[PDB]
Each structure stands twice: as C-alpha cells, then as structure tokens.
C-alpha cells in the first residue's frame, strides 16, 4: 500500500560510496597484507558474513582496525569492497580464483555462487 | 562490463534497517519534540539535504544528538525516517501535509515532488 521508490536503495548506496570516497564517518580500517582500506562497518556487516559476525560481537564491535588473513589477496578484497558499495562485480579470468576464494573467506555466499557460475561459463 | 547485482542495493538497505532495529552502530539520536529516534548518520546524510549539510560540517559531524525544530510533527518525521531505510513512503490523506512540510524541512526534494503529485491526484 506504500508508494515504492524504485531507485531509492541504489541512490542510498551511491551516496554511501561517495561518503567512503571522502572518508566521511568511516569507522574502520581493513588491513590486507601491505594494503589498507577504510569503510563503514554498517556496510561491511550488510554485505559479509565475516564482518557481520565480527562486529555483532560486543567484544569486537568497537574495533577500529581489522587485520585480515595475510594470505588474502588485496586486489581480490578491493574488488569485493567495491562490489559492496556499487552492486557491480568485476570478474575476469585474471582475478576469478582470487575473488572467489576471498568471497568464501568473507562469507559472501551469493557472490561465491556467482563466481561458480562464472567458472562454469568459462 | 561489470556483472550487475540487481537486488544488492535493496539487500544492503534492508540490512541497514535491521541494524537500526537492533540499535547496532547507530550514532545519533534525532529529537523531535517529545519523541526520539536513533539512526545511522550515514543513512540520514544519504537521504536528506538537511542531515547531509549538518554532518558534512566538521563543526557538527561528531554530534550524537540533533534537536529538530519543535514545530516538526514527530509522526511526519517517523514516516520519512522509515522511508529512508525502506524505499517505501506511507502517504495518506491524514498525513500528506505533515509529511510534505517535514520533507521540505529535511530537504528531501524528490519526496517533496512526490507529495505534490499525491496532492494533485487527490
Ligand atoms: O546478512 C548479513 C551479511 N551478509 C551478506 C551476505 C551474507 C552471506 O552470504 N552469509 C552471511 N552469514 C552470516 C554469518 O553467519 C554465516 C552466514 N551473512 C551475509 N548481515 C545482516 C543480517 C541480518 N541483520 C543485519 C545484517 Cl547487517
Ligand atoms: O545528496 C545527498 C542527500 N540528499 C538526498 C536527497 C537530497 C535533496 O533533495 N537535496 C540535498 N541537498 C544537499 C544540501 O544542499 C541542498 C540540497 N541533498 C539530498 N547526500 C550526498 C550527496 C553527495 N555525496 C554524499 C552524500 Cl551522503
Ligand atoms: Cl568522519
Ligand atoms: Cl553499537
């Protein structure tokens, strides 16, 4: 019965990404080997089982730095972080295995499923 | 060239609303006369000119309480806050004028335009 605004969610996500690009109200640094990426915990939680599980725990909720597994490919992580904030996933033959393994680690099941479909179509 | 996830933005917004409902990582209380509403500043900024302008200013960015104009109808505000987190706007004959005036105050231009269309269709 409510009026539906079809573009609203995408508009919100766009603006959250704009805030990320200006480092406004970002509240965590994700360290992946020699690279670091800032983000909003709320978005990470919305998009990742790993981050949801980390930040829902009152023991870790207030952490401002998260060190990921050193084995994680920083580029794979970056691709997934960008996907979180844009809805667009950059899969290529050169990055498919790194992105897929990283998505497994981040517990992003729908993305893992999409990587499986990409492999199947390759 | 990137794979588009058509439901992703709405999924993110849904999960942000779930976090709001559990008061997880909310960082501001919006006081509207005798009522109060918690939220995430990032979402408020994404959806409102007023909140964008308030929290982008380094003078006010860290405020944890915002007192709105006492004249603002709390129900009108609540309807708009729910819209921010859901994409669904509950317009009715009983609330149209309060919602519209509140949307003007919050500088939510697309919503104001929609209220004008509602008035025109009434
Ligand atoms: O749902 C997510 C995050 N999210 C996105 C994809 C995805 C996924 O594929 N799996 C998991 N989990 C969770 C932890 O346990 C194992 C599986 N979470 C995922 N956030 C969430 C859920 C409920 N209210 C608020 C929030 Cl923010
Ligand atoms: O765009 C908005 C918020 N938003 C939503 C609707 C709406 C609107 O109708 N008007 C205005 N303004 C802004 C202030 O000046 C007057 C008009 N902002 C609006 N956030 C935003 C913009 C750019 N990067 C990051 C962010 Cl979060
Ligand atoms: Cl900030
Ligand atoms: Cl919290």
CSV table of C-alpha atoms and ligand atoms in Angstrom, one decimal:
chain,number,residue,atom,x,y,z
A,1,UNK,CA,0.0,0.0,0.0
A,2,UNK,CA,3.0,2.3,0.3
A,3,UNK,CA,4.5,4.2,-2.6
A,4,UNK,CA,7.6,2.4,-3.8
A,5,UNK,CA,10.7,4.5,-4.8
A,6,UNK,CA,12.4,2.1,-7.2
A,7,UNK,CA,15.7,4.0,-7.4
A,8,UNK,CA,16.0,4.9,-3.7
A,9,UNK,CA,18.2,1.9,-2.5
A,10,UNK,CA,20.7,2.4,-5.3
A,11,UNK,CA,20.7,6.2,-4.6
A,12,UNK,CA,21.5,5.5,-0.9
A,13,UNK,CA,24.3,3.1,-1.8
A,14,UNK,CA,25.8,5.6,-4.2
A,15,UNK,CA,25.8,8.2,-1.6
A,16,UNK,CA,27.4,5.9,1.0
A,17,UNK,CA,30.1,5.2,-1.6
A,18,UNK,CA,30.5,9.0,-2.0
A,19,UNK,CA,30.9,9.3,1.7
A,20,UNK,CA,33.5,6.4,1.7
A,21,UNK,CA,35.4,8.3,-1.0
A,22,UNK,CA,35.7,11.3,1.2
A,23,UNK,CA,36.4,9.2,4.3
A,24,UNK,CA,33.3,10.7,6.0
A,25,UNK,CA,32.1,8.7,9.0
A,26,UNK,CA,34.2,5.7,8.1
A,27,UNK,CA,34.9,3.9,11.3
A,28,UNK,CA,37.2,1.0,10.5
A,29,UNK,CA,40.4,0.3,8.5
A,30,UNK,CA,40.7,-3.2,7.0
A,31,UNK,CA,44.3,-4.3,6.7
A,32,UNK,CA,45.1,-6.8,4.0
A,33,UNK,CA,48.8,-7.6,4.0
A,34,UNK,CA,50.5,-4.4,2.8
A,35,UNK,CA,47.3,-2.5,1.9
A,36,UNK,CA,44.6,-0.8,3.9
A,37,UNK,CA,41.1,0.1,3.1
A,38,UNK,CA,38.7,2.3,5.1
A,39,UNK,CA,35.0,1.6,5.2
A,40,UNK,CA,31.8,1.9,7.2
A,41,UNK,CA,31.2,-1.1,9.4
A,42,UNK,CA,27.5,-1.0,8.7
A,43,UNK,CA,28.0,-1.6,5.0
A,44,UNK,CA,30.6,-4.3,5.7
A,45,UNK,CA,28.1,-6.0,8.0
A,46,UNK,CA,25.3,-5.7,5.5
A,47,UNK,CA,27.4,-7.4,2.8
A,48,UNK,CA,29.6,-10.0,4.5
A,49,UNK,CA,29.1,-12.9,6.9
A,50,UNK,CA,32.5,-12.5,8.3
A,51,UNK,CA,32.1,-8.8,9.0
A,52,UNK,CA,28.6,-9.3,10.3
A,53,UNK,CA,29.9,-11.9,12.8
A,54,UNK,CA,32.8,-9.8,13.8
A,55,UNK,CA,31.0,-6.6,14.5
A,56,UNK,CA,27.8,-8.1,16.1
A,57,UNK,CA,30.0,-9.5,18.8
A,58,UNK,CA,30.2,-6.9,21.6
A,59,UNK,CA,33.8,-7.9,22.1
A,60,UNK,CA,34.8,-6.7,18.7
A,61,UNK,CA,32.1,-4.2,17.8
A,62,UNK,CA,34.2,-1.1,18.6
A,63,UNK,CA,37.4,-2.2,16.9
A,64,UNK,CA,38.8,0.4,14.5
A,65,UNK,CA,41.3,-1.9,12.8
A,66,UNK,CA,40.7,-5.4,11.5
A,67,UNK,CA,43.6,-7.4,10.2
A,68,UNK,CA,42.5,-10.0,7.7
A,69,UNK,CA,44.3,-13.2,7.0
A,70,UNK,CA,47.7,-12.4,5.4
A,71,UNK,CA,47.0,-14.9,2.7
A,72,UNK,CA,44.1,-12.9,1.3
A,73,UNK,CA,44.8,-11.2,-2.0
A,74,UNK,CA,44.5,-7.4,-1.5
A,75,UNK,CA,43.2,-7.0,-5.1
A,76,UNK,CA,40.5,-9.6,-4.5
A,77,UNK,CA,39.5,-7.8,-1.4
A,78,UNK,CA,39.4,-4.5,-3.1
A,79,UNK,CA,37.1,-5.9,-5.9
A,80,UNK,CA,34.7,-7.2,-3.3
A,81,UNK,CA,34.8,-3.9,-1.2
A,82,UNK,CA,33.9,-2.0,-4.4
A,83,UNK,CA,31.1,-4.5,-5.1
A,84,UNK,CA,29.7,-3.9,-1.6
A,85,UNK,CA,29.4,-0.2,-2.3
A,86,UNK,CA,28.3,-0.4,-6.0
A,87,UNK,CA,26.5,-3.7,-6.8
A,88,UNK,CA,29.0,-4.2,-9.6
A,89,UNK,CA,31.4,-7.2,-9.5
A,90,UNK,CA,34.4,-7.1,-11.7
A,91,UNK,CA,35.0,-10.7,-12.6
A,92,UNK,CA,37.7,-11.5,-15.1
A,93,UNK,CA,39.8,-14.6,-16.0
A,94,UNK,CA,42.8,-13.0,-14.3
A,95,UNK,CA,41.0,-12.4,-11.0
A,96,UNK,CA,38.2,-15.1,-10.8
A,97,UNK,CA,40.1,-17.5,-8.5
A,98,UNK,CA,41.4,-14.7,-6.1
A,99,UNK,CA,37.9,-13.1,-5.9
A,100,UNK,CA,36.2,-16.4,-5.3
A,101,UNK,CA,38.5,-17.5,-2.5
A,102,UNK,CA,38.2,-14.1,-0.9
A,103,UNK,CA,34.4,-14.2,-1.2
A,104,UNK,CA,34.5,-17.5,0.6
A,105,UNK,CA,36.6,-16.1,3.4
A,106,UNK,CA,34.3,-13.0,3.7
A,107,UNK,CA,31.3,-15.3,3.7
A,108,UNK,CA,29.6,-13.7,0.8
A,109,UNK,CA,27.6,-16.7,-0.4
A,110,UNK,CA,25.7,-15.1,-3.3
A,111,UNK,CA,28.9,-13.8,-4.7
A,112,UNK,CA,30.6,-17.2,-4.3
A,113,UNK,CA,27.7,-18.7,-6.2
A,114,UNK,CA,28.1,-16.1,-9.0
A,115,UNK,CA,31.8,-16.9,-9.2
A,116,UNK,CA,30.9,-20.6,-9.6
A,117,UNK,CA,28.6,-19.6,-12.5
A,118,UNK,CA,31.5,-17.6,-14.0
A,119,UNK,CA,33.8,-20.6,-13.8
A,120,UNK,CA,31.1,-22.7,-15.4
A,121,UNK,CA,30.7,-20.2,-18.3
A,122,UNK,CA,34.5,-20.1,-18.8
B,1,UNK,CA,31.4,-4.6,-18.3
B,2,UNK,CA,30.9,-5.5,-14.7
B,3,UNK,CA,28.3,-8.0,-13.5
B,4,UNK,CA,25.3,-6.2,-12.1
B,5,UNK,CA,23.6,-7.5,-8.9
B,6,UNK,CA,20.1,-6.1,-9.3
B,7,UNK,CA,18.9,-6.8,-5.7
B,8,UNK,CA,22.1,-5.8,-4.0
B,9,UNK,CA,21.3,-2.2,-3.1
B,10,UNK,CA,17.9,-3.1,-1.7
B,11,UNK,CA,19.5,-6.0,0.3
B,12,UNK,CA,22.0,-3.6,1.8
B,13,UNK,CA,19.3,-1.1,2.8
B,14,UNK,CA,17.3,-3.9,4.3
B,15,UNK,CA,20.3,-5.0,6.4
B,16,UNK,CA,21.0,-1.4,7.5
B,17,UNK,CA,17.4,-1.2,8.7
B,18,UNK,CA,17.9,-4.5,10.5
B,19,UNK,CA,20.9,-2.9,12.2
B,20,UNK,CA,18.8,0.2,13.1
B,21,UNK,CA,16.2,-2.1,14.7
B,22,UNK,CA,18.8,-3.6,16.9
B,23,UNK,CA,20.5,-0.2,17.6
B,24,UNK,CA,23.7,-1.6,16.2
B,25,UNK,CA,26.3,1.1,15.3
B,26,UNK,CA,23.7,3.8,15.4
B,27,UNK,CA,25.5,7.0,16.2
B,28,UNK,CA,22.9,9.7,16.6
B,29,UNK,CA,19.6,10.4,18.3
B,30,UNK,CA,17.2,12.7,16.5
B,31,UNK,CA,14.9,14.5,18.9
B,32,UNK,CA,11.6,15.7,17.6
B,33,UNK,CA,9.6,17.4,20.4
B,34,UNK,CA,8.7,14.7,22.9
B,35,UNK,CA,9.9,11.8,20.7
B,36,UNK,CA,13.4,10.5,19.9
B,37,UNK,CA,14.6,8.3,17.0
B,38,UNK,CA,18.0,6.7,16.7
B,39,UNK,CA,19.7,6.3,13.3
B,40,UNK,CA,23.0,6.0,11.4
B,41,UNK,CA,24.3,9.4,10.3
B,42,UNK,CA,25.5,7.9,7.0
B,43,UNK,CA,22.0,6.9,6.0
B,44,UNK,CA,20.5,10.3,7.1
B,45,UNK,CA,23.1,12.0,5.0
B,46,UNK,CA,22.4,9.8,2.1
B,47,UNK,CA,18.7,10.7,2.2
B,48,UNK,CA,18.4,14.3,3.4
B,49,UNK,CA,19.9,17.7,2.4
B,50,UNK,CA,19.5,18.9,6.0
B,51,UNK,CA,21.3,16.0,7.5
B,52,UNK,CA,23.9,16.0,4.8
B,53,UNK,CA,24.6,19.6,5.4
B,54,UNK,CA,24.7,19.2,9.2
B,55,UNK,CA,27.1,16.2,9.3
B,56,UNK,CA,29.4,17.3,6.5
B,57,UNK,CA,30.3,20.3,8.6
B,58,UNK,CA,33.3,19.4,10.7
B,59,UNK,CA,31.8,21.6,13.4
B,60,UNK,CA,28.8,19.2,13.8
B,61,UNK,CA,29.9,15.9,12.4
B,62,UNK,CA,30.5,14.3,15.7
B,63,UNK,CA,27.3,15.4,17.4
B,64,UNK,CA,25.4,12.5,19.0
B,65,UNK,CA,22.1,14.4,19.5
B,66,UNK,CA,20.3,16.6,17.0
B,67,UNK,CA,17.3,18.6,18.1
B,68,UNK,CA,15.0,19.3,15.2
B,69,UNK,CA,12.6,22.3,15.1
B,70,UNK,CA,10.0,21.8,17.8
B,71,UNK,CA,7.3,22.6,15.2
B,72,UNK,CA,8.1,19.4,13.2
B,73,UNK,CA,5.5,16.7,13.5
B,74,UNK,CA,7.1,13.6,15.1
B,75,UNK,CA,4.9,11.2,13.0
B,76,UNK,CA,5.8,13.0,9.8
B,77,UNK,CA,9.4,12.6,10.7
B,78,UNK,CA,9.0,8.9,11.6
B,79,UNK,CA,7.3,8.3,8.2
B,80,UNK,CA,10.3,9.9,6.5
B,81,UNK,CA,12.9,8.0,8.6
B,82,UNK,CA,11.2,4.8,7.7
B,83,UNK,CA,11.2,5.7,4.0
B,84,UNK,CA,14.9,6.4,4.2
B,85,UNK,CA,15.6,2.8,5.4
B,86,UNK,CA,12.9,1.1,3.2
B,87,UNK,CA,12.2,3.0,0.0
B,88,UNK,CA,8.5,2.9,0.9
B,89,UNK,CA,6.6,6.1,1.6
B,90,UNK,CA,3.4,5.9,3.5
B,91,UNK,CA,1.3,8.8,2.2
B,92,UNK,CA,-2.3,9.1,3.2
B,93,UNK,CA,-4.8,12.0,3.3
B,94,UNK,CA,-4.4,12.2,7.1
B,95,UNK,CA,-0.6,12.6,6.9
B,96,UNK,CA,0.1,14.2,3.5
B,97,UNK,CA,0.5,17.8,4.7
B,98,UNK,CA,2.7,16.9,7.7
B,99,UNK,CA,4.9,14.6,5.6
B,100,UNK,CA,5.3,17.2,2.9
B,101,UNK,CA,6.2,20.0,5.2
B,102,UNK,CA,8.6,17.8,7.0
B,103,UNK,CA,10.2,16.7,3.8
B,104,UNK,CA,10.7,20.3,2.9
B,105,UNK,CA,12.5,20.9,6.2
B,106,UNK,CA,14.6,17.8,5.7
B,107,UNK,CA,15.4,18.9,2.2
B,108,UNK,CA,14.2,15.7,0.5
B,109,UNK,CA,13.4,17.2,-2.8
B,110,UNK,CA,12.3,14.1,-4.7
B,111,UNK,CA,10.0,13.2,-1.8
B,112,UNK,CA,8.5,16.7,-1.8
B,113,UNK,CA,7.9,16.4,-5.5
B,114,UNK,CA,6.1,13.0,-4.8
B,115,UNK,CA,4.0,14.7,-2.2
B,116,UNK,CA,3.0,17.4,-4.8
B,117,UNK,CA,2.0,14.6,-7.1
B,118,UNK,CA,-0.1,13.0,-4.3
B,119,UNK,CA,-1.9,16.3,-3.7
B,120,UNK,CA,-2.5,16.6,-7.4
B,121,UNK,CA,-4.0,13.1,-7.5
B,122,UNK,CA,-6.2,13.8,-4.5
C,1,LIG,O1,23.3,-10.9,6.3
C,1,LIG,C1,24.2,-10.1,6.6
C,1,LIG,C2,25.5,-10.1,5.9
C,1,LIG,N1,25.6,-11.0,4.7
C,1,LIG,C3,25.6,-10.6,3.4
C,1,LIG,C4,25.8,-11.8,2.7
C,1,LIG,C5,25.9,-12.9,3.6
C,1,LIG,C6,26.1,-14.3,3.5
C,1,LIG,O2,26.2,-14.9,2.4
C,1,LIG,N2,26.2,-15.0,4.7
C,1,LIG,C7,26.2,-14.4,6.0
C,1,LIG,N3,26.3,-15.2,7.2
C,1,LIG,C8,26.2,-14.5,8.4
C,1,LIG,C9,27.0,-15.1,9.5
C,1,LIG,O3,26.9,-16.5,9.5
C,1,LIG,C10,27.1,-17.2,8.3
C,1,LIG,C11,26.5,-16.6,7.2
C,1,LIG,N4,25.9,-13.0,6.1
C,1,LIG,C12,25.8,-12.3,4.9
C,1,LIG,N5,24.0,-9.1,7.5
C,1,LIG,C13,22.9,-8.9,8.3
C,1,LIG,C14,22.0,-10.0,8.6
C,1,LIG,C15,20.9,-9.7,9.5
C,1,LIG,N6,20.7,-8.5,10.1
C,1,LIG,C16,21.6,-7.5,9.8
C,1,LIG,C17,22.7,-7.7,9.0
C,1,LIG,CL1,23.8,-6.4,8.7
C,2,LIG,O1,22.6,14.1,-1.7
C,2,LIG,C1,22.6,13.8,-0.5
C,2,LIG,C2,21.4,13.8,0.4
C,2,LIG,N1,20.2,14.1,-0.3
C,2,LIG,C3,19.2,13.2,-0.6
C,2,LIG,C4,18.2,13.9,-1.2
C,2,LIG,C5,18.6,15.3,-1.2
C,2,LIG,C6,18.0,16.5,-1.7
C,2,LIG,O2,16.9,16.6,-2.3
C,2,LIG,N2,18.7,17.7,-1.6
C,2,LIG,C7,20.0,17.7,-1.0
C,2,LIG,N3,20.8,19.0,-0.8
C,2,LIG,C8,22.0,18.9,-0.2
C,2,LIG,C9,22.3,20.1,0.6
C,2,LIG,O3,22.1,21.3,-0.2
C,2,LIG,C10,20.8,21.4,-0.6
C,2,LIG,C11,20.2,20.2,-1.3
C,2,LIG,N4,20.6,16.5,-0.5
C,2,LIG,C12,19.8,15.3,-0.7
C,2,LIG,N5,23.8,13.3,0.1
C,2,LIG,C13,25.1,13.2,-0.5
C,2,LIG,C14,25.4,13.9,-1.7
C,2,LIG,C15,26.7,13.8,-2.2
C,2,LIG,N6,27.7,13.0,-1.6
C,2,LIG,C16,27.3,12.3,-0.5
C,2,LIG,C17,26.0,12.3,0.1
C,2,LIG,CL1,25.6,11.4,1.5
C,3,LIG,CL1,34.4,11.4,9.7
C,4,LIG,CL1,26.5,-0.2,18.7
